Each structure stands twice: as structure tokens, then as C-alpha cells.
Amino acid sequence: ATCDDGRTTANAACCILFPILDDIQENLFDGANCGEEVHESLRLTFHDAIGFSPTLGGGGADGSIIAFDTIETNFPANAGIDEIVSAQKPFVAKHNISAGDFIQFAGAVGVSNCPGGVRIPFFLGRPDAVAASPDHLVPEPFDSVDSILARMGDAGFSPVEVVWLLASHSIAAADKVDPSIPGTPFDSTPEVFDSQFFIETQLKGRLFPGTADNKGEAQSPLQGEIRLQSDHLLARDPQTACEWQSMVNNQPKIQNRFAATMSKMALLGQDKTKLIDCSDVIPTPPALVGAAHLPAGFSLSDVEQACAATPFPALTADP
Ligand code: HEM
Ligand SMILES: C[As](C)(=O)[O-]
Ligand SMILES: C[As](C)(=O)[O-]
Ligand SMILES: [Ca+2]
Ligand SMILES: [Ca+2]
Ligand SMILES: [Fe+3]
Ligand SMILES: [Fe+3]
Ligand SMILES: [Fe+3]
Ligand SMILES: [Zn+2]
Ligand SMILES: [Zn+2]
Ligand SMILES: [Zn+2]
Ligand SMILES: [Zn+2]
Ligand SMILES: [Zn+2]
Ligand SMILES: [Zn+2]
Ligand SMILES: [Zn+2]
């Protein structure tokens, strides 16, 4: 199909997305960059979708975190998310798509701006949210591995799928974990969707980049970086350590698993056979330019190898 302006897409119904794409690319993403708003919007896709529990309720990827923001944004685990919700609200008001669709669309658009990134499958047609998420559904950085795997499992994700989804932390920072140093990234390349995150989480911790007693924070190996206690544990726990290490310098796996699992998350609470596939409106992501590697002055002796079956891979070091 050919839309009013000459752009094409497989299903004509997808045409309404093109002006929305242009609007968000300039006005939310600072001109199609992989920056702060991309990161927050990708976080938002998760804090929307994971509000889903067979026992407790919540409609999943339904736009509830916008529609019921007054409730959801005051949950402790949602600290800091009010900023991006308030930034997305005017676009949702202005355009003719549901908040659930908008959140997933903005997340997939944003991720496509990141070198090494992926086009997450996107489906159009979610109805407006009809309930707030229950509290206590979003994993927290001071939660155990057992707790996180049980929560994500409750929502339908296996342990390997949790690791795959945490490739998100390759383009991410924290603002509230240590509010003395807001905006500190989880890897040395927060504007590149790469395996740096899985390498750097495996390094021996050395320092706290800000203050030293924050709940849910572990030592970081690098002054410009913050480490979550949840990521420290997942990189090391016998349940997840071997999958974690398998991501290192495995960019094809990161891409293919992240996109597939994000699609599954984007569809929590929904039914893709009632939705329309609009994946071809999402832009083509830029490529990686070079290999993930150790930071300057590090070596493999700085890696806390945690997988019994398989030696951590050789890596070069930024010299
Ligand atoms: C599995 C358990 C997870 C835990 C415990 C966790 C925890 C956290 C924490 C504490 C922050 C920083 C919040 C702040 O202080 O500003 C954060 C940021 C973020 N998370 Fe995770 N998260 C998890 C899974 C996920 C998943 C599945 C996604 C997939 C979309 C995701 C995407 C992000 C992004 C992109 C950021 C950066 C936000 C920003 O830069 O402002 N997270 N997460
Ligand atoms: C039950 As919980 C994910 O708030 O520790
Ligand atoms: C004290 As809790 C179950 O919200 O991690
Ligand atoms: Ca929701
Ligand atoms: Ca990165
Ligand atoms: Fe509201
Ligand atoms: Fe913030
Ligand atoms: Fe580097
Ligand atoms: Zn900006
Ligand atoms: Zn922000
Ligand atoms: Zn519009
Ligand atoms: Zn809780
Ligand atoms: Zn908790
Ligand atoms: Zn942020
Ligand atoms: Zn364990």
C-alpha cells in the first residue's frame, strides 16, 4: 500500500503511523537519536507490559501506566517514570492511537535509532486500558534472582528470556538508584545497543560512582557507570550466568533474542491475530562499527567468570 505521502507499508491501516513516527522522531527523540528519551521509552514499555499477573490482574501492554498514571507512577518500583509518561501524554492526546499502542510504538521507534539495534515487531490496534496494574508487579534492583525469575515467569518469561530482555540495559541509565548522580549508565556505551553491558557487569566491582549505601546498588568497575545489585546477581547466579556470558560478543544472538522477546512482551495481555502487523513502519537501525571489548587498563583477569561449562571469551581491551 502507498500512503498519502508516498511512503509504503504492507497494510494500509498502518499509514496513520507515519506522521506519528515523524513527530516522535523529532520531538521525543531529539532528531532520531539514541538518547535519554529512547532509554526512558524502552523502560516504559516494560513497566507498562509487566503489570500482568494471572492471579493479581493487570492488563499487560495496555497503556495503563499513562491512562492510570496517578496511581501507577506512585508505585515505588516506578520511581522516575513520571517524567517519560508526562512527555508521552501530549502525543497520545494529539494523535489517534491508543496509549498502549503508542508506548510500544515509541519504544520500537526509539530502539531503532541505536547503533547495533533492532526493529522490534510492532502491532497496531490495542484497545484503551481498562484497569491500573496492581502494585508489586515490577521487579526491583534489590529483589532476589528467585523473586525476579518468579515474577517474570508468572508473566510468561523463562530465565533465558529474562537475560535476553536485559540486553535493554545496554542502552540505559539510572536516575533514582543514586540520586546524587542521576543519568549514570549501566554500560560504557549507553547510546550503542551492544554486548558491553554483559561484559562490564561481569567485571570485578571496584568503586561506588556516587555514594556508597544505596539500596539495590552494587559496586561498579568504572567511574562513569552504575551497577545494579539485580544485574550483579543475574550475571553470577547458577540459574542465569551461563546464558549471561553467552551474550558476550554475540551480537546476532542479542539482536535476534531481544527483538523476539520484546515482541512477546509488547503483546502481553493482547492477541496479535486481532491486531495489524505494522512492523515495516519502524525505521532500519544503524549497524555497529566495531567490536565490544574491555575498557582501557583491564584484562581478562578482571572478569569474574561464572559459567562452569564454558570459559569466558578472549576479548581485546581499548588499549
Ligand atoms: C528483570 C528485572 C529488571 C530490573 C530489576 C530492572 C531495574 C532497573 C532499574 C533500577 C533502573 C533504573 C531506574 C532509575 O533509577 O532511574 C532500570 C532502568 C532501565 N531499564 Fe531495567 N530492570 C529490569 C528489567 C528491564 C527490562 C526487561 C527492560 C526491557 C525494556 C528494561 C529496560 C530498562 C531501560 C531502558 C532503563 C533505562 C531508563 C533510563 O535511562 O532512564 N529493564 N531498570
Ligand atoms: C513482589 As515485588 C516484584 O514488588 O518484590
Ligand atoms: C519489600 As518488596 C516485596 O516490594 O521487594
Ligand atoms: Ca500496563
Ligand atoms: Ca551499550
Ligand atoms: Fe492521569
Ligand atoms: Fe529521569
Ligand atoms: Fe569503550
Ligand atoms: Zn532529549
Ligand atoms: Zn529523563
Ligand atoms: Zn495524528
Ligand atoms: Zn513489592
Ligand atoms: Zn521487590
Ligand atoms: Zn533516565
Ligand atoms: Zn540462585
* Experimental determination approach used: X-ray
Chain-centre distance for alpha carbon 247: 16
Q: CA angle 215-191-203, nearest 5°?
A: 50
Dist CA 229 CA 218 (whole Å): 5
- Entry resolution (Å): 1.8
Long-range contact pairs involving 203-212 (C-beta distance under 8 Å, separation at least 24): 203/298, 203/302, 203/303, 203/304, 204/302, 204/303, 204/304, 205/232, 208/178, 209/178, 209/181, 209/184, 210/178, 210/180, 210/181, 210/184, 211/178, 211/180
In terms of Cα–Cα distance, which of 246, 196, 245, 192 is closest to 221? Answer: 196
Q: CA angle 251-253-258, nearest 5°?
A: 100
Contact 131/57 with Cβ under 8 angstroms? yes
List every span in the chain annotated with CATH 1.10.420.10. Answer: 139-249+290-319
**Cα-Cα-Cα-Cα dihedral of 143, 173, 261, 285, to 10°?**
-170
Q: CA angle 197-203-208, nearest 5°?
A: 90
Please give the DSSP secondary-structure letter assigned to residue 113.
Answer: T
Dist CA 242 CA 256 (whole Å): 18
Contact 236/197 with Cβ under 8 angstroms? no
Provide the CATH number for the domain formed by 1-138+250-289 in this structure.
1.10.520.10
96 CB-side CA count, 13 A: 6
The residue whose CB lies within 8 Å of the most ligand 1 atoms, and thus the one to mutate among 83, 169, 181, is 169
Helices (H), the chain: 17-27, 36-49, 64-67, 69-72, 82-94, 99-111, 145-154, 159-165, 196-200, 229-236, 241-246, 251-266
All residues at 6 or more sequence positions from 56 whose CB lies less than 8 Å from its CB, including other chains: 134, 136, 137
Give the burial string for 239-249 (b: 16+ CB within 10 Å, else e): bbbebbbbbbb
Ligand 1 contacts CB of residue 176 (under 6 A):
yes
CATH topology (fold) of 139-249+290-319: Peroxidase; domain 2 (1.10.420)
Dist CA 307 CA 235 (whole Å): 9
Ligand 1 contacts CB of residue 43 (under 6 A):
yes
Output the CA–CA distances (angstroms, integers) from residue 89 to 70, 124, 255, 260, in the order listed. 13, 18, 29, 27
**DSSP per position, 154-201:** HTT--HHHHHHHGGGGGG-EESSSSTTSTTEESSS-TTS-STHHHHHT
Instruction: Tell me the catalytic residues.
Output: 47, 164
List every span in the chain annotated with CATH 1.10.520.10. Answer: 1-138+250-289
- Amino acid identity of 209? P
Ligand 1 contacts CB of residue 266 (under 6 A):
no
Terminal-residue alpha carbon distance, the chain = 51
Dist. CA 78 → ligand 13 center (Å): 12
Residue nearest to atom 3 of ligand 3 (CA): 136
Which residues form the pocket of ligand 3, taking CB atoms under 6 Å from any ligand atom? 136, 140, 143
In terms of Cα–Cα distance, which of 313, 318, 302 is closest to 251? Answer: 313
Ligand 1 contacts CB of residue 272 (under 6 A):
no
Output the CA–CA distances (angstroms, integers) from residue 194 to 47, 66, 172, 292, in the order listed. 22, 30, 12, 7
Residue 277 sits at φ, ψ, to 5 deg, of -75, 115
Dist. CA 165 → ligand 1 center (Å): 10
